[PDB]
Point group: D2
Chain length 349, copies 4
Amino acid sequence: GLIYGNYLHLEKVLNAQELQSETKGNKIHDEHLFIITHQAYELWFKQILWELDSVREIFQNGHVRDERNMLKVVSRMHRVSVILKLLVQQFSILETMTALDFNDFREYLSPASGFQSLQFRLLENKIGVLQNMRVPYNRRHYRDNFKGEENELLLKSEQEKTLLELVEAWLERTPGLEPHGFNFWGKLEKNITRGLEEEFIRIQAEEKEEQVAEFQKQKEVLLSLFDEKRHEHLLSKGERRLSYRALQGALMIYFYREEPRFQVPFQLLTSLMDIDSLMTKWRYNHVCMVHRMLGSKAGTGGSSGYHYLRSTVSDRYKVFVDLFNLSTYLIPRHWIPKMNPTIHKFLEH
Amino acid sequence: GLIYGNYLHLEKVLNAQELQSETKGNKIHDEHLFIITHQAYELWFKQILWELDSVREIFQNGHVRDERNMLKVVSRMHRVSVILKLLVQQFSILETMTALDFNDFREYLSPASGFQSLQFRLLENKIGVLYRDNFKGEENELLLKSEQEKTLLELVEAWLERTPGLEPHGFNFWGKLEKNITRGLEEEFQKQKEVLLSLFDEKRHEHLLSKGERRLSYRALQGALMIYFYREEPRFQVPFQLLTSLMDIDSLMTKWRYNHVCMVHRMLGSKAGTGGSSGYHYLRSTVSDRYKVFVDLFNLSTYLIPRHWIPKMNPTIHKFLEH
Amino acid sequence: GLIYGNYLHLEKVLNAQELQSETKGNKIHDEHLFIITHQAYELWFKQILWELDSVREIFQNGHVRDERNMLKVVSRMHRVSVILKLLVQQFSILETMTALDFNDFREYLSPASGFQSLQFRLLENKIGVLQNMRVPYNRRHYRDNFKGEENELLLKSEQEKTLLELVEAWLERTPGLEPHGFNFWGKLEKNITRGLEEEFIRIQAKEEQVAEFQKQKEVLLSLFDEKRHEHLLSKGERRLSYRALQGALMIYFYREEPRFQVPFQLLTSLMDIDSLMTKWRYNHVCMVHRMLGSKAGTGGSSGYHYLRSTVSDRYKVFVDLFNLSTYLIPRHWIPKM
Amino acid sequence: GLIYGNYLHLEKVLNAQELQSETKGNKIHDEHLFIITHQAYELWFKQILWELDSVREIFQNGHVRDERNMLKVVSRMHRVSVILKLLVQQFSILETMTALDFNDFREYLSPASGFQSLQFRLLENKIGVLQNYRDNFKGEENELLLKSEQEKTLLELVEAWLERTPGLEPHGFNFWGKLEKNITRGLEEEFIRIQAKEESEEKEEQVAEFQKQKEVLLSLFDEKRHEHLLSKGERRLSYRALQGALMIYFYREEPRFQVPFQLLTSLMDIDSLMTKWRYNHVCMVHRMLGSKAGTGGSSGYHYLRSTVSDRYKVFVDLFNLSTYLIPRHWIPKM
Ligand code: HEM
Ligand code: HEM
Ligand code: HEM
Ligand code: HEM
Ligand SMILES: N[C@@H](Cc1c[nH]c2ccccc12)C(=O)O
Ligand SMILES: N[C@@H](Cc1c[nH]c2ccccc12)C(=O)O
Ligand SMILES: N[C@@H](Cc1c[nH]c2ccccc12)C(=O)O
Ligand SMILES: N[C@@H](Cc1c[nH]c2ccccc12)C(=O)O
Ligand SMILES: N[C@@H](Cc1c[nH]c2ccccc12)C(=O)O
Ligand SMILES: N[C@@H](Cc1c[nH]c2ccccc12)C(=O)O
Ligand SMILES: N[C@@H](Cc1c[nH]c2ccccc12)C(=O)O
Ligand SMILES: N[C@@H](Cc1c[nH]c2ccccc12)C(=O)O
């Protein structure tokens, strides 16, 4: 007969708390809070990876093509986002430890650090952090912190398809992009040209000289969206992550989100942004706690400490930057290519 | 030397997830979340036990008498509050599991249930909640001892009885208080008068104690009111924070029970639980003041009077209640 | 050009703070907190009403029929829940006021109370709380607080279609229920009857299980008892029509089918809102207990004891959505498509 | 008789919502959310100002000297951080507005913006955000803003109180003189240990780390270095207020120091939460605008990112004192 403790394997979970300060002569009371906190984070990291891998598989094995699977995909991605909120507020518990009491056992931690968290790196990689985009500390690649089987695992996570790459391929298949079909991009380029011209004609008919200047730059940006060569250049700089065609699909889903087939997909894209946003907030809440804990002391793990972490709060680690930056090309509602009754029907369940 | 995963014994923590649906033929994806969620709770239960026992020990070994320890005491108790708030919020994660998906692996859980959580019971007992069939062997022992050892309620109680100002040949708070309330009432209804004076009925209080309506002794109650009214006095400041934290822990506990109820409702409807209870209904009954260990601290708000009525503290007792 | 303060009408919002303790002689510092806190609850009440009326309108005027609008409906209802979530937590700001400090200005408040909040009642009604659902004290006093224009709005909020009623009509049109078509209810009764029979066979092949089985057979088959449904629909155990219940269950079982994906989100949101309204009632209670103890309320209720009575399923407008969990069956039994 | 709606002045509060999009024809449903959200923020800003001024007065009028008042001071300061935490969470509400729906009424907002929030500026100044923006303000509002720059800030008031911390006096406990003495000996003893070790790469690694540590620790006792950093703005507290804060950190368990230590912790909490407000703000603004310039004239997203830095952290020094934490046995005995 199943027993709660055995089902949950608490004989392992609740016998995993060894205070290094205890195993060295003077246990420091607050080291217990320190271990439990990290262990709770790591248990949730594992859950995130579980969801994340299942969603990667759904894309990879072709099942995302069958649109009855979108509810499951969006519901699991949103769950990753919900766990991450919890992880962001979880720092409030560690923050009840003063820096003085932390100071009483910090000496027993060296040279271990969060640099040695296998799962945090797995998670970064599987979402789609580019290894060359990573802020360096001590002049070498992050994987130097791992050896053997763990190193092997990390390498596979750098090599296997990332959430970013999977979502990208799917985005490239978004209905409506086909030039000989609805031809979204063609119609969009045309409609933006018209809009601008009607807008310029309206303007030229202090405010004027300014509105002209304001017009002139909005025009450059909007029209630059159709410069594919410019995009390719920004791709290789890692300034952009998505392929030109994938950007098109994403924009297609933004504009026509209310169309029934695009409603859950638009929720997914929103979730992808949520997850980028939560991950960075995790980083920043981390940074704020570490400032109070260390001041400007160097880290047990070999970094500058507070200062290094601060530099990781940046778009370098924002995998779906392209989804955020699409808001740059938002246009007036009536500029958006109208849908005929055939494609309106194409995009119905 | 030391490595992250070894340090945290991730070898154990991250190798502790066995889907009962998987070992039984058809693995259900959402059972992983079900397992991880309970494991995170238990970890935090263990942390709470760790803080709680450490605070009980400070009361027990006499260190609480040394008032330089109050900061340690309040801060650890506040920490318990903070952890509990996260635990209340943590239900929102499990709530991303639809009842339908839950329904796909629930069959593999019987007869197990939360009734078998050792740490939850240890928690309730050590705080002062006044089922053990669900345990036996060595676990029944710890459970036994947690009922027999002095509770947080009893330890706070004794400490509350030693509160300065409560001695009849000293500042005589209680005598002075009955005088000022007898005066102020007749200076000024019958219903408030009835209630306010019943505070001075020690006999009524003892009767309510045995009835279980009240937990703290009469004397301990007096110290608590003394700390409320004079909380700004330096020696009472951190003690007042402590009383506040005790009340915090009480609310968060039932808020835990209640968020639990709301989720279980959506998961089970009116089905009976795997542990043999009526389920939702049974859980609804635990969200009551029967489980509120520090009810008296809440109830004291009944007897709050105008500032004027409060026994003026002369310069003698003022300098005494200075650090 | 417009300016922030003017745009937001801050000349109204930030000039709305009058400390009654200050008006009557002695300013008590924490009354400001007290005031701002309610004002913020009411701004959000207004917002909730705004989302809510607009979703009601989408149902009422037929727009929901075009499923293009389902993203809007679910986004706004989920928005209502996100706001309620914030409002549950907002109590922690007022909890930084000790009971002893509150007691220094409580006297200047009587006989006014939260009981006189028009928007809270509007919200209750527009979601769908019926007069019968209300606690006896509340039923004969909630409307006896307002007059004229406010009383006008209250009557409307009850006379007009509720979210409950509107969602009920729409659930009744759930594709799949039509007997000439997919005949969901017919297939379901057949499959469950077959399932129970296979199950009873398995248990006979092997004392507790037969007893468990029997209770479960009793409950499941009872689902198909429409008369029982109406009887319960009169003791107030149930609120939704029979057919609407079938639509809800249809959306649960077939939630992955694309036309049901967003509808399923909506039912979940509906339950979220119910939960969060009660968690609001309960956080409220927990606070008030520490503020009043056993003292009666300024509005004349018993205080703690009364408020605690509102933390009841009798106030859950969508109880049925919760209670359909009672009737969940193994995947295998669900009628195939 | 007093009535709820009247008490709260809801005739003002619930009649303050004017959708500009509506005023110009096409009502956009989400503009209402946008308005209510900002209005809620401003009510909470007002509450913060209220609490914050009350605490400033306690200091300014000398009431902090009477230590009866420390419970009030800390509880109100803690109250401020509890409000700020809600304000940070409050962004999640506005985040249920998509960028495309925001786009439908954004044009009606120009040229208003958060630059024109009076209360947010007052908040910054009163806490003590160093000057080195009033363009967006005029008239009486401009006046108030000046007054907030000239009146004593929370930072300045806490600084003065820290300068009066008991224990600092040289002919009394002489905390600083003793602290320097013990640090110097502590390091010299640590250095003896390292020297004893056998010549290795590890030993040199320990010597090298030691030297870096010794230099940092002992620079605590360089007052000229501190003054130089003050002038550069890289620091904010006087040298002596720093000694007081350190005194309170080290001896926090001493009864007279318990609640003051809570106070200092609360200050760091508020810095931490202000910057978390700015960053949550940033994250939302990126989804809303991408790289479009703000209606208020800034570059937008890029500008807001720059406000998320220690340039705005009023109590940096309280954070940076963790740089000088030492082993317990080096702390001067009482
Ligand atoms: C007192 C509390 C903490 C301190 C002082 C601290 C400090 C640091 C420091 C200084 C680093 C940079 C590496 C180094 O030089 O050591 C770091 C990295 C890291 N820490 Fe923390 N940390 C704390 C709490 C936590 C917690 C609770 C977690 C939960 C898993 C965590 C996870 C990580 C991770 C994943 C990294 C790598 C981050 C990256 O490179 O982006 N830390 N930490
Ligand atoms: C889908 C989620 C859950 C369901 C359906 C559920 C259901 C139940 C039920 C029906 C009971 C009463 C005993 C029984 O008949 O089995 C119970 C008890 C209990 N469960 Fe949960 N539960 C859930 C999640 C959790 C979680 C995540 C925890 C975290 C540790 C937890 C901890 C407890 C505790 C401590 C009790 C005993 C409570 C008391 O007696 O006051 N449960 N649960
Ligand atoms: C110190 C804080 C509070 C106390 C002591 C308190 C107390 C009470 C009491 C006693 C009642 C019952 C009516 C009566 O007899 O007066 C009540 C009802 C109510 N209050 Fe509060 N309250 C507090 C804060 C709030 C806040 C912040 C709100 C936010 C809007 C609020 C809104 C309401 C509402 C809507 C009702 C009617 C509830 C129902 O009928 O279910 N109250 N309150
Ligand atoms: C869709 C939502 C929002 C957007 C797109 C947005 C955008 C911006 C931008 C672009 C600026 C820089 C000035 C400019 O060029 O306009 C700014 C500043 C500011 N905003 Fe927001 N904002 C939003 C919501 C809010 C909310 C809810 C508040 C609450 C009061 C707020 C308060 C402020 C404040 C106080 C500033 C000045 C901050 C500083 O200069 O450090 N904003 N905002
Ligand atoms: N489901 C189809 C079509 C598709 C691709 N990307 C999409 C985005 C939104 C909606 C549909 C699609 C496929 O995967 O090939
Ligand atoms: N790197 C941290 C120490 C630390 C944080 N989390 C850890 C987990 C395990 C081991 C060490 C750590 C510091 O410099 O203070
Ligand atoms: N510390 C002393 C005095 C004391 C008892 N109870 C208190 C409550 C508040 C302040 C001081 C006390 C003791 O433990 O006996
Ligand atoms: N008692 C729960 C099952 C359950 C909840 N949490 C558990 C933890 C372990 C084992 C079983 C459970 C039910 O009736 O559905
Ligand atoms: N949208 C159609 C059909 C419908 C009713 N209820 C539904 C639930 C889910 C999907 C479609 C429907 C209508 O309103 O009449
Ligand atoms: N009913 C509350 C008083 C109260 C709570 N919230 C209010 C808002 C406005 C006016 C009065 C109130 C009591 O009995 O103490
Ligand atoms: N309260 C006294 C002494 C004092 C100043 N700073 C302190 C810090 C901690 C404890 C006491 C003090 C004063 O204001 O002058
Ligand atoms: N600054 C925002 C507009 C904005 C945000 N909050 C505001 C409050 C009032 C007026 C305008 C705003 C933008 O550039 O899009």
